[PDB]
Amino acid sequence: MLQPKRTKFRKMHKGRNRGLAQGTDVSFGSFGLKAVGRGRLTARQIEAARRAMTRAVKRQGKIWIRVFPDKPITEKPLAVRMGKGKGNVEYWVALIQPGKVLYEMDGVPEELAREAFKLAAAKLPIKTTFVTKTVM
Amino acid sequence: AKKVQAYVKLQVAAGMANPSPPVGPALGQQGVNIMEFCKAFNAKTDSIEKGLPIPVVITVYADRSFTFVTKTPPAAVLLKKAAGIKSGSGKPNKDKVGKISRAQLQEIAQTKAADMTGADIEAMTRSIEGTARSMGLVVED
Amino acid sequence: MFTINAEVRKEQGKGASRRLRAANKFPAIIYGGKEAPLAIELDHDKVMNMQAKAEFYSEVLTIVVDGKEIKVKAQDVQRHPYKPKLQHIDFVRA
Amino acid sequence: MALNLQDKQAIVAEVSEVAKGALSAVVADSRGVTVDKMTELRKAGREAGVYMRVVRNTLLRRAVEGTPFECLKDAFVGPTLIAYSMEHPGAAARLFKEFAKANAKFEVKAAAFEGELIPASQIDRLATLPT
Amino acid sequence: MKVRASVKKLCRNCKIVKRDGVIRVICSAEPKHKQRQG
Amino acid sequence: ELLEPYLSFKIYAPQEYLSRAYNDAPKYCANIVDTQLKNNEVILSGEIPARCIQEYRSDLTFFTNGRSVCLTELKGYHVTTGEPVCQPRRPNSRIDKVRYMFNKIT
RNA sequence: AGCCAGGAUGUUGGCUUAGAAGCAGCCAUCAUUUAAAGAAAGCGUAAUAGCUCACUGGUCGAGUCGGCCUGCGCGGAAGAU
């Protein structure tokens, strides 16, 4: 579970998710995992998918994670009335507009990487697709 | 030339009369007696050096005993006394465990040619010398 | 075989470029040198196969337009955010 | 299967073995054995080297493609499985009779040893060889 | 028999079939690989 | 250092079922041992621990098809096996000065 | 796409010597005989043996396999006068 180390403010705003993400190209590894869909990813989903593919590459190569949570998500406790205040923080989503790279991979064969990214695309609510590094 | 029936190529050093902790049941898995692999196993061993693991055909037949034709010991155990070190692979390309040369390994190659199938001696040279590359050994050409 | 037929653009802007993008063609422009920049419309189906080669981003292109040939390089390119398609390319003159 | 650059090469190389070649014999192991592979091919080591090519690819458009350029009668051998065996040392070598003796030595069949073209003859056993 | 909505092939002997408009995965080899739904 | 006896247990099984007796080997705690066939009858020299040896008899009554037969006797104090190193209480009581050994614990 | 074939001798290879041996995990991932064979994708063993595909011949004899881009649909989809 990834999480920011101290922040300017605890609770913050819901906010809208409009737009498309900057993280387009693969910039480190040989292969990426571009998000086709749209939506927040909790810090657990990043870690769950993170271990679902680190297994398939068998601790070989290197796997960068291009997204980082940095967004607190409050929650009103069960059986509580409206009002009284913004609720306590629970988990740290990272909003994912379409086109965002999520994981990048290097040091492994391609079709194996297809397997490792596939079994980790399973853990992500958003629909993703496999991509590849380009000569600009 | 009958095909597969029950023959296998597995036994340890030839000097170990009547093995049991190594092979044990495997040679006794058929109807052949355990006594067959020491009183007759040593009948050809005495002709040459003892202690060298030499595979041999064990074509078992219903008529008590079995025919057999001795072959050639593997090159892996051959790379010990003739290579000095008793070790082998484990750490191949990561470091040089040892080395010999082509002038000597090719000289032993034709002694094994009676069992090897090659159109020419040079063709059987690197196929044996290439087995020592799996050991991490680097032949000196 | 680095050659691409290309009609000249007539309607610049985001409006006409959406209508054109859906027609399996995308906008592009050639610029550089003392000459003034000239926008160059071209087909999408052909260029999409060309980028696969490492040479397409390095070796000079020979785009034909109005009969006259203009050697160019792919100094810049704009990927589509998730659909496998090109949107616009900056063909700097060589 | 590999494209034309590799298929034609396998034929042109066989043609080079015909210009200097001579005697050859059919063989058709519909149920061959690798132990039999260590008989007629080990014999090549007894003779000289690897230059002999059993080339079991008697396709009517492949091996027979080189037929019009060398020995037109061989195209009649094209039907069914056939394996030519060109010779270079010793014209009318004793290799021809071996294909028949091996057929009685656990080989099931060997295309009835019909032979090729030195007297332009047919399925005729011949002990009359330069020995 | 299994009734999973996903019916990716298990062993190499499986073959997709659409009986009565219903996707199925028949298997001449192992009966356990047989499954409904799809 | 806990240890358990592992006496050898030879057994006779029909050769046709003898291949089914090797499957019982992976379930049995015993390690493989030398054996020799005897015409249609077959036998092999096993060696398994006595804690599980009492269940070995159930294995030859099923896989043998009624032809199973075996015999063994306790031997070899060496053994040692997991897990946890459980021990059977208790020792000892009804002896002089036994309550003073409790002071030695602390 | 089917069809009788073939799909090797040392590799009981060194390894922690109780065994891993084409297939637990380590590495190398040889090269030969050759129409062809990875010193190995799966099955099967305490380990082997064994059974297939990779690949390659013949029979056969005309087109076919595998991805993308999307259109329209199928399944997933069970509630109580």
PDB file of C-alpha atoms in Angstrom, chain C:
ATOM      1  CA  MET C   1       9.651   2.989 -50.527  1.00  0.00           C
ATOM      2  CA  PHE C   2       9.494   6.086 -48.285  1.00  0.00           C
ATOM      3  CA  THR C   3       6.997   8.050 -50.384  1.00  0.00           C
ATOM      4  CA  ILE C   4       3.583   9.428 -49.393  1.00  0.00           C
ATOM      5  CA  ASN C   5       1.033  11.126 -51.639  1.00  0.00           C
ATOM      6  CA  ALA C   6      -0.521  14.108 -49.894  1.00  0.00           C
ATOM      7  CA  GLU C   7      -3.160  16.676 -50.829  1.00  0.00           C
ATOM      8  CA  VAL C   8      -2.817  20.255 -49.602  1.00  0.00           C
ATOM      9  CA  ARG C   9      -4.951  21.318 -46.647  1.00  0.00           C
ATOM     10  CA  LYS C  10      -7.619  23.957 -47.263  1.00  0.00           C
ATOM     11  CA  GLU C  11      -9.429  24.318 -43.895  1.00  0.00           C
ATOM     12  CA  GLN C  12      -7.163  24.747 -40.870  1.00  0.00           C
ATOM     13  CA  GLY C  13      -8.574  24.550 -37.356  1.00  0.00           C
ATOM     14  CA  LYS C  14      -9.924  22.128 -34.761  1.00  0.00           C
ATOM     15  CA  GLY C  15     -13.334  21.941 -36.444  1.00  0.00           C
ATOM     16  CA  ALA C  16     -12.334  20.645 -39.868  1.00  0.00           C
ATOM     17  CA  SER C  17      -9.615  18.469 -38.302  1.00  0.00           C
ATOM     18  CA  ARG C  18     -12.181  16.392 -36.406  1.00  0.00           C
ATOM     19  CA  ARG C  19     -14.177  15.704 -39.577  1.00  0.00           C
ATOM     20  CA  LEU C  20     -10.917  14.791 -41.319  1.00  0.00           C
ATOM     21  CA  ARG C  21      -9.619  12.612 -38.470  1.00  0.00           C
ATOM     22  CA  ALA C  22     -12.615  10.263 -38.701  1.00  0.00           C
ATOM     23  CA  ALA C  23     -12.025   9.712 -42.447  1.00  0.00           C
ATOM     24  CA  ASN C  24      -8.938   7.502 -41.876  1.00  0.00           C
ATOM     25  CA  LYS C  25      -6.679  10.517 -42.522  1.00  0.00           C
ATOM     26  CA  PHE C  26      -4.931  12.952 -40.208  1.00  0.00           C
ATOM     27  CA  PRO C  27      -3.504  16.477 -40.514  1.00  0.00           C
ATOM     28  CA  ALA C  28       0.206  17.247 -40.883  1.00  0.00           C
ATOM     29  CA  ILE C  29       2.513  20.135 -41.775  1.00  0.00           C
ATOM     30  CA  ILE C  30       5.946  20.622 -43.366  1.00  0.00           C
ATOM     31  CA  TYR C  31       8.118  23.495 -42.148  1.00  0.00           C
ATOM     32  CA  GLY C  32      11.725  24.632 -41.878  1.00  0.00           C
ATOM     33  CA  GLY C  33      14.175  26.682 -43.914  1.00  0.00           C
ATOM     34  CA  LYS C  34      13.712  30.154 -45.329  1.00  0.00           C
ATOM     35  CA  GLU C  35      10.449  28.973 -46.903  1.00  0.00           C
ATOM     36  CA  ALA C  36       7.202  29.560 -45.019  1.00  0.00           C
ATOM     37  CA  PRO C  37       5.473  26.563 -43.390  1.00  0.00           C
ATOM     38  CA  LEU C  38       2.957  24.667 -45.517  1.00  0.00           C
ATOM     39  CA  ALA C  39       0.267  22.397 -44.098  1.00  0.00           C
ATOM     40  CA  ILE C  40       0.120  18.967 -45.732  1.00  0.00           C
ATOM     41  CA  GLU C  41      -2.903  16.655 -45.496  1.00  0.00           C
ATOM     42  CA  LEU C  42      -2.141  12.955 -45.822  1.00  0.00           C
ATOM     43  CA  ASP C  43      -3.681   9.520 -45.358  1.00  0.00           C
ATOM     44  CA  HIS C  44      -3.606   7.671 -42.024  1.00  0.00           C
ATOM     45  CA  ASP C  45      -3.869   4.050 -43.203  1.00  0.00           C
ATOM     46  CA  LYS C  46      -0.511   4.184 -45.010  1.00  0.00           C
ATOM     47  CA  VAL C  47       1.623   6.076 -42.474  1.00  0.00           C
ATOM     48  CA  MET C  48       0.411   3.871 -39.604  1.00  0.00           C
ATOM     49  CA  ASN C  49       2.264   0.874 -41.062  1.00  0.00           C
ATOM     50  CA  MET C  50       5.370   2.953 -41.830  1.00  0.00           C
ATOM     51  CA  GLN C  51       6.220   3.994 -38.257  1.00  0.00           C
ATOM     52  CA  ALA C  52       6.879   0.360 -37.295  1.00  0.00           C
ATOM     53  CA  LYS C  53      10.307   0.524 -38.926  1.00  0.00           C
ATOM     54  CA  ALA C  54      13.019   2.220 -36.892  1.00  0.00           C
ATOM     55  CA  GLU C  55      14.045   3.960 -40.117  1.00  0.00           C
ATOM     56  CA  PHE C  56      10.790   5.931 -40.396  1.00  0.00           C
ATOM     57  CA  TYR C  57      11.836   8.147 -37.491  1.00  0.00           C
ATOM     58  CA  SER C  58      15.400   8.589 -38.804  1.00  0.00           C
ATOM     59  CA  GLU C  59      15.815   8.227 -42.580  1.00  0.00           C
ATOM     60  CA  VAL C  60      14.448  11.121 -44.626  1.00  0.00           C
ATOM     61  CA  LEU C  61      10.944  10.939 -46.098  1.00  0.00           C
ATOM     62  CA  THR C  62      10.105  11.887 -49.692  1.00  0.00           C
ATOM     63  CA  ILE C  63       6.530  13.150 -49.425  1.00  0.00           C
ATOM     64  CA  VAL C  64       5.040  14.129 -52.796  1.00  0.00           C
ATOM     65  CA  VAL C  65       2.621  17.067 -52.901  1.00  0.00           C
ATOM     66  CA  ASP C  66       1.225  18.895 -55.956  1.00  0.00           C
ATOM     67  CA  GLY C  67       3.725  16.962 -58.050  1.00  0.00           C
ATOM     68  CA  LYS C  68       6.695  18.589 -56.338  1.00  0.00           C
ATOM     69  CA  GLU C  69       8.666  16.454 -53.878  1.00  0.00           C
ATOM     70  CA  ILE C  70       9.688  17.695 -50.420  1.00  0.00           C
ATOM     71  CA  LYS C  71      12.211  15.728 -48.365  1.00  0.00           C
ATOM     72  CA  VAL C  72      11.257  15.814 -44.674  1.00  0.00           C
ATOM     73  CA  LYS C  73      12.102  14.261 -41.301  1.00  0.00           C
ATOM     74  CA  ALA C  74       9.864  13.110 -38.444  1.00  0.00           C
ATOM     75  CA  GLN C  75      11.183  15.487 -35.809  1.00  0.00           C
ATOM     76  CA  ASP C  76       7.922  15.236 -33.853  1.00  0.00           C
ATOM     77  CA  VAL C  77       4.797  13.080 -33.687  1.00  0.00           C
ATOM     78  CA  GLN C  78       1.581  13.030 -31.637  1.00  0.00           C
ATOM     79  CA  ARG C  79       0.250   9.686 -30.408  1.00  0.00           C
ATOM     80  CA  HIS C  80      -3.412   9.055 -29.843  1.00  0.00           C
ATOM     81  CA  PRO C  81      -4.022   8.719 -26.091  1.00  0.00           C
ATOM     82  CA  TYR C  82      -5.364   5.134 -26.169  1.00  0.00           C
ATOM     83  CA  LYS C  83      -6.611   4.222 -29.658  1.00  0.00           C
ATOM     84  CA  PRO C  84      -3.784   2.880 -31.841  1.00  0.00           C
ATOM     85  CA  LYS C  85      -3.770   5.791 -34.294  1.00  0.00           C
ATOM     86  CA  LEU C  86      -1.727   8.832 -35.274  1.00  0.00           C
ATOM     87  CA  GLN C  87      -3.085  12.362 -34.942  1.00  0.00           C
ATOM     88  CA  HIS C  88      -0.455  14.778 -36.303  1.00  0.00           C
ATOM     89  CA  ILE C  89       3.213  14.751 -37.368  1.00  0.00           C
ATOM     90  CA  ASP C  90       5.759  17.583 -37.720  1.00  0.00           C
ATOM     91  CA  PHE C  91       7.647  16.908 -40.971  1.00  0.00           C
ATOM     92  CA  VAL C  92      10.611  19.253 -40.654  1.00  0.00           C
ATOM     93  CA  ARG C  93      12.189  19.807 -44.063  1.00  0.00           C
ATOM     94  CA  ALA C  94      15.573  18.162 -44.609  1.00  0.00           C
TER      95      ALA C  94
END
